[PDB]
Amino acid sequence: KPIWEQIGSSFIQHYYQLFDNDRTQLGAIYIDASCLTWKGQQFQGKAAIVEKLSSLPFQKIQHSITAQDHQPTPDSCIISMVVGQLKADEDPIMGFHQMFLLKNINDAWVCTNDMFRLALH
Amino acid sequence: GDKPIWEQIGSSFIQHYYQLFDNDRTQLGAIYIDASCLTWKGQQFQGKAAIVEKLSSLPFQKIQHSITAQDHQPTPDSCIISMVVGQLKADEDPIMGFHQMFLLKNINDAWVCTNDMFRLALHNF
Numbered sequence A: 001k002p003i004w005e006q007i008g009s010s011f012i013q014h015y016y017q018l019f020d021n022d023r024t025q026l027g028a029i030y031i032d033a034s035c036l037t038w039k040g041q042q043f044q045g046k047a048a049i050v051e052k053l054s055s056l057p058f059q060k061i062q063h064s065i066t067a068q069d070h071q072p073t074p075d076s077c078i079i080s081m082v083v084g085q086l087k088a089d090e091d092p093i094m095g096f097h098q099m100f101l102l103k104n105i106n107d108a109w110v111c112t113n114d115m116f117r118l119a120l121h
Numbered sequence B: 001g002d003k004p005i006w007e008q009i010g011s012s013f014i015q016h017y018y019q020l021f022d023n024d025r026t027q028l029g030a031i032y033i034d035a036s037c038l039t040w041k042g043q044q045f046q047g048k049a050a051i052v053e054k055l056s057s058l059p060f061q062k063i064q065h066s067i068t069a070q071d072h073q074p075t076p077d078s079c080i081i082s083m084v085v086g087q088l089k090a091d092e093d094p095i096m097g098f099h100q101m102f103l104l105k106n107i108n109d110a111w112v113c114t115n116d117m118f119r120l121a122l123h124n125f
Helices: A003-020 A046-054 B005-023 B048-056
Strands: A030-038 A041-044 A061-072 A077-088 A094-105 A108-118 B032-040 B043-046 B063-074 B080-090 B096-107 B110-120
Touching: A003 A061, A003 A077, A003 A094, A003 A108, A030 A046, A030 B063, A041 A046, A061 B032, A061 B110, A077 B096, A077 B110, A094 B080, A094 B096, A108 B063, A108 B080, B005 B063, B005 B080, B005 B096, B005 B110, B032 B048, B043 B048
Parallel strands: A030 A108, B032 B110
Antiparallel strands: A030 A041, A061 A077, A077 A094, A094 A108, B032 B043, B063 B080, B080 B096, B096 B110
16 A cells, blocks of 8 residues: 555544544644534634544444545645444444545644534435 | 635635536646646546546536535645535436545645545445
Protein backbone atom coordinates (compact mmCIF):
# COMPACT_ATOMS: atom_id res chain seq x y z
CA LYS A 1 0.00 0.00 0.00
CA PRO A 2 1.15 3.56 -0.78
CA ILE A 3 2.38 5.70 2.12
CA TRP A 4 -0.81 7.80 2.43
CA GLU A 5 -2.98 4.64 2.83
CA GLN A 6 -0.67 3.38 5.56
CA ILE A 7 -0.95 6.69 7.47
CA GLY A 8 -4.70 7.13 6.84
CA SER A 9 -5.58 3.51 7.81
CA SER A 10 -3.60 3.71 11.03
CA PHE A 11 -5.14 7.11 11.88
CA ILE A 12 -8.73 5.78 11.42
CA GLN A 13 -7.93 2.55 13.40
CA HIS A 14 -6.66 4.83 16.21
CA TYR A 15 -9.67 7.20 15.99
CA TYR A 16 -12.36 4.44 16.05
CA GLN A 17 -10.57 2.42 18.77
CA LEU A 18 -10.51 5.53 20.94
CA PHE A 19 -14.12 6.43 20.00
CA ASP A 20 -15.52 2.98 20.92
CA ASN A 21 -13.45 2.45 24.10
CA ASP A 22 -12.50 5.76 25.83
CA ARG A 23 -13.84 8.82 23.99
CA THR A 24 -12.59 11.37 26.57
CA GLN A 25 -9.12 10.44 25.24
CA LEU A 26 -9.98 11.71 21.71
CA GLY A 27 -8.09 15.03 22.38
CA ALA A 28 -4.79 13.33 21.50
CA ILE A 29 -5.55 13.19 17.73
CA TYR A 30 -6.75 16.80 17.45
CA ILE A 31 -4.88 20.11 17.80
CA ASP A 32 -6.14 23.29 19.49
CA ALA A 33 -7.43 24.87 16.24
CA SER A 34 -9.13 21.66 14.95
CA CYS A 35 -12.64 21.99 13.55
CA LEU A 36 -15.50 19.47 13.81
CA THR A 37 -18.78 19.50 11.95
CA TRP A 38 -21.03 16.89 13.66
CA LYS A 39 -24.34 16.35 11.84
CA GLY A 40 -24.28 19.96 10.53
CA GLN A 41 -23.33 21.60 13.88
CA GLN A 42 -19.87 23.13 14.01
CA PHE A 43 -17.65 22.63 17.05
CA GLN A 44 -14.50 24.81 17.03
CA GLY A 45 -11.31 24.06 18.86
CA LYS A 46 -10.11 21.08 20.89
CA ALA A 47 -11.96 21.89 24.13
CA ALA A 48 -15.37 22.15 22.34
CA ILE A 49 -14.71 19.04 20.24
CA VAL A 50 -13.69 16.88 23.22
CA GLU A 51 -16.66 18.17 25.29
CA LYS A 52 -19.15 17.36 22.50
CA LEU A 53 -17.82 13.81 21.84
CA SER A 54 -17.48 12.99 25.56
CA SER A 55 -21.07 14.13 26.26
CA LEU A 56 -22.85 12.13 23.52
CA PRO A 57 -25.70 10.28 25.24
CA PHE A 58 -24.78 6.60 24.71
CA GLN A 59 -22.78 4.33 26.93
CA LYS A 60 -21.54 1.82 24.38
CA ILE A 61 -20.79 2.55 20.74
CA GLN A 62 -19.23 0.32 18.13
CA HIS A 63 -18.29 1.33 14.60
CA SER A 64 -17.55 -0.79 11.62
CA ILE A 65 -15.99 0.57 8.44
CA THR A 66 -17.48 -0.52 5.16
CA ALA A 67 -15.14 1.44 2.88
CA GLN A 68 -12.16 3.76 3.47
CA ASP A 69 -10.53 5.93 0.78
CA HIS A 70 -7.30 7.90 1.33
CA GLN A 71 -5.47 10.58 -0.67
CA PRO A 72 -2.38 12.79 -0.41
CA THR A 73 -2.82 16.54 -1.05
CA PRO A 74 -0.31 18.89 -2.75
CA ASP A 75 0.57 20.66 0.55
CA SER A 76 1.55 17.49 2.46
CA CYS A 77 -1.81 16.60 4.06
CA ILE A 78 -3.81 13.34 3.91
CA ILE A 79 -7.57 13.18 3.31
CA SER A 80 -9.33 10.06 4.67
CA MET A 81 -12.95 9.32 3.79
CA VAL A 82 -14.96 6.54 5.51
CA VAL A 83 -18.36 4.99 5.03
CA GLY A 84 -19.56 2.63 7.74
CA GLN A 85 -22.11 1.43 10.22
CA LEU A 86 -22.36 2.04 13.92
CA LYS A 87 -24.30 0.66 16.81
CA ALA A 88 -24.94 2.65 19.96
CA ASP A 89 -26.33 0.78 22.97
CA GLU A 90 -29.66 -0.80 21.90
CA ASP A 91 -30.55 1.56 19.09
CA PRO A 92 -30.76 0.09 15.62
CA ILE A 93 -27.69 0.03 13.39
CA MET A 94 -27.11 3.29 11.53
CA GLY A 95 -24.98 4.08 8.48
CA PHE A 96 -22.50 6.97 8.71
CA HIS A 97 -20.15 9.09 6.60
CA GLN A 98 -16.98 10.60 8.02
CA MET A 99 -14.10 12.63 6.59
CA PHE A 100 -10.77 13.57 8.12
CA LEU A 101 -8.06 16.03 7.05
CA LEU A 102 -4.72 15.00 8.54
CA LYS A 103 -1.57 17.14 8.84
CA ASN A 104 1.93 16.38 10.04
CA ILE A 105 2.52 18.81 12.93
CA ASN A 106 5.56 18.34 15.18
CA ASP A 107 6.50 15.02 13.53
CA ALA A 108 3.08 13.39 14.21
CA TRP A 109 -0.08 13.11 12.17
CA VAL A 110 -3.03 14.94 13.75
CA CYS A 111 -6.57 15.63 12.56
CA THR A 112 -7.28 19.27 11.75
CA ASN A 113 -10.68 18.94 10.12
CA ASP A 114 -13.43 16.39 10.91
CA MET A 115 -16.87 16.07 9.34
CA PHE A 116 -19.51 13.50 10.40
CA ARG A 117 -22.96 12.74 9.01
CA LEU A 118 -25.42 9.89 9.63
CA ALA A 119 -26.85 8.17 6.55
CA LEU A 120 -30.62 8.70 6.49
CA HIS A 121 -33.14 5.91 5.98
CA GLY B 1 -21.17 39.92 8.60
CA ASP B 2 -23.23 36.75 7.95
CA LYS B 3 -22.01 33.79 5.82
CA PRO B 4 -18.35 32.94 6.09
CA ILE B 5 -16.36 33.09 2.85
CA TRP B 6 -15.55 29.33 2.71
CA GLU B 7 -19.29 28.50 2.85
CA GLN B 8 -19.89 31.03 0.05
CA ILE B 9 -17.11 29.66 -2.16
CA GLY B 10 -17.70 25.99 -1.28
CA SER B 11 -21.46 26.13 -1.96
CA SER B 12 -21.11 27.91 -5.30
CA PHE B 13 -18.30 25.46 -6.26
CA ILE B 14 -20.62 22.47 -5.44
CA GLN B 15 -23.50 23.91 -7.48
CA HIS B 16 -21.21 24.62 -10.45
CA TYR B 17 -19.51 21.17 -10.29
CA TYR B 18 -22.86 19.22 -10.32
CA GLN B 19 -24.36 21.47 -13.04
CA LEU B 20 -21.32 20.74 -15.18
CA PHE B 21 -21.39 17.04 -14.14
CA ASP B 22 -25.10 16.59 -15.05
CA ASN B 23 -25.15 18.65 -18.30
CA ASP B 24 -21.79 18.10 -20.02
CA ARG B 25 -18.98 16.37 -18.14
CA THR B 26 -16.27 17.05 -20.78
CA GLN B 27 -16.31 20.65 -19.45
CA LEU B 28 -15.16 19.39 -16.00
CA GLY B 29 -11.45 19.93 -16.88
CA ALA B 30 -11.68 23.66 -15.99
CA ILE B 31 -12.06 22.95 -12.23
CA TYR B 32 -9.08 20.59 -11.97
CA ILE B 33 -5.39 21.27 -12.46
CA ASP B 34 -2.53 19.02 -13.52
CA ALA B 35 -1.69 18.01 -9.94
CA SER B 36 -5.36 17.14 -9.15
CA CYS B 37 -6.30 13.78 -7.74
CA LEU B 38 -9.53 11.75 -8.18
CA THR B 39 -10.57 8.57 -6.34
CA TRP B 40 -13.71 7.18 -8.03
CA LYS B 41 -15.12 4.16 -6.16
CA GLY B 42 -11.72 3.16 -4.71
CA GLN B 43 -9.66 3.68 -7.90
CA GLN B 44 -7.11 6.51 -7.86
CA PHE B 45 -6.62 8.73 -10.96
CA GLN B 46 -3.65 11.19 -10.86
CA GLY B 47 -3.70 14.33 -13.01
CA LYS B 48 -6.16 16.38 -15.04
CA ALA B 49 -5.96 14.39 -18.29
CA ALA B 50 -6.54 11.02 -16.53
CA ILE B 51 -9.44 12.49 -14.45
CA VAL B 52 -11.22 13.96 -17.45
CA GLU B 53 -10.90 10.73 -19.47
CA LYS B 54 -12.33 8.62 -16.59
CA LEU B 55 -15.31 10.99 -16.07
CA SER B 56 -15.98 11.25 -19.83
CA SER B 57 -15.95 7.44 -20.16
CA LEU B 58 -18.64 6.59 -17.55
CA PRO B 59 -21.42 4.52 -19.15
CA PHE B 60 -24.45 6.70 -18.30
CA GLN B 61 -26.28 8.88 -20.78
CA LYS B 62 -28.30 10.91 -18.28
CA ILE B 63 -27.22 11.75 -14.76
CA GLN B 64 -28.85 13.84 -12.07
CA HIS B 65 -27.46 14.64 -8.68
CA SER B 66 -29.40 15.89 -5.73
CA ILE B 67 -27.67 17.12 -2.61
CA THR B 68 -29.05 16.10 0.77
CA ALA B 69 -26.35 17.80 2.80
CA GLN B 70 -23.18 19.86 2.17
CA ASP B 71 -20.63 20.72 4.89
CA HIS B 72 -17.74 23.23 4.33
CA GLN B 73 -14.70 24.13 6.45
CA PRO B 74 -11.55 26.26 6.07
CA THR B 75 -8.28 24.30 6.39
CA PRO B 76 -5.12 25.63 8.12
CA ASP B 77 -3.22 26.26 4.84
CA SER B 78 -6.06 28.40 3.39
CA CYS B 79 -7.90 25.69 1.48
CA ILE B 80 -11.62 24.94 1.56
CA ILE B 81 -12.66 21.35 2.35
CA SER B 82 -16.19 20.23 1.51
CA MET B 83 -18.23 17.06 2.22
CA VAL B 84 -21.37 16.25 0.25
CA VAL B 85 -23.98 13.53 0.93
CA GLY B 86 -26.74 13.09 -1.65
CA GLN B 87 -28.60 10.91 -4.11
CA LEU B 88 -28.01 10.25 -7.76
CA LYS B 89 -30.22 9.07 -10.53
CA ALA B 90 -28.54 7.77 -13.64
CA ASP B 91 -30.59 6.64 -16.63
CA GLU B 92 -33.17 4.04 -15.48
CA ASP B 93 -31.04 2.68 -12.68
CA PRO B 94 -32.38 2.80 -9.16
CA ILE B 95 -31.64 5.92 -7.12
CA MET B 96 -28.38 5.46 -5.24
CA GLY B 97 -26.89 7.33 -2.29
CA PHE B 98 -23.40 8.80 -2.71
CA HIS B 99 -20.80 10.69 -0.73
CA GLN B 100 -18.25 13.10 -2.22
CA MET B 101 -15.42 15.23 -0.85
CA PHE B 102 -13.69 18.21 -2.52
CA LEU B 103 -10.52 20.03 -1.43
CA LEU B 104 -10.33 23.51 -3.00
CA LYS B 105 -7.33 25.79 -3.41
CA ASN B 106 -7.06 29.34 -4.73
CA ILE B 107 -4.59 29.43 -7.62
CA ASN B 108 -4.31 32.53 -9.88
CA ASP B 109 -7.32 34.27 -8.26
CA ALA B 110 -9.52 31.17 -8.89
CA TRP B 111 -10.64 28.30 -6.69
CA VAL B 112 -9.60 25.00 -8.22
CA CYS B 113 -10.14 21.43 -7.04
CA THR B 114 -6.98 19.61 -6.12
CA ASN B 115 -8.56 16.51 -4.48
CA ASP B 116 -11.86 14.79 -5.31
CA MET B 117 -13.18 11.54 -3.81
CA PHE B 118 -16.46 9.85 -4.75
CA ARG B 119 -18.10 6.69 -3.49
CA LEU B 120 -21.56 5.12 -3.99
CA ALA B 121 -23.52 3.86 -1.00
CA LEU B 122 -24.23 0.18 -1.66
CA HIS B 123 -27.60 -1.40 -0.91
CA ASN B 124 -27.31 -4.07 1.80
CA PHE B 125 -29.23 -7.05 0.34
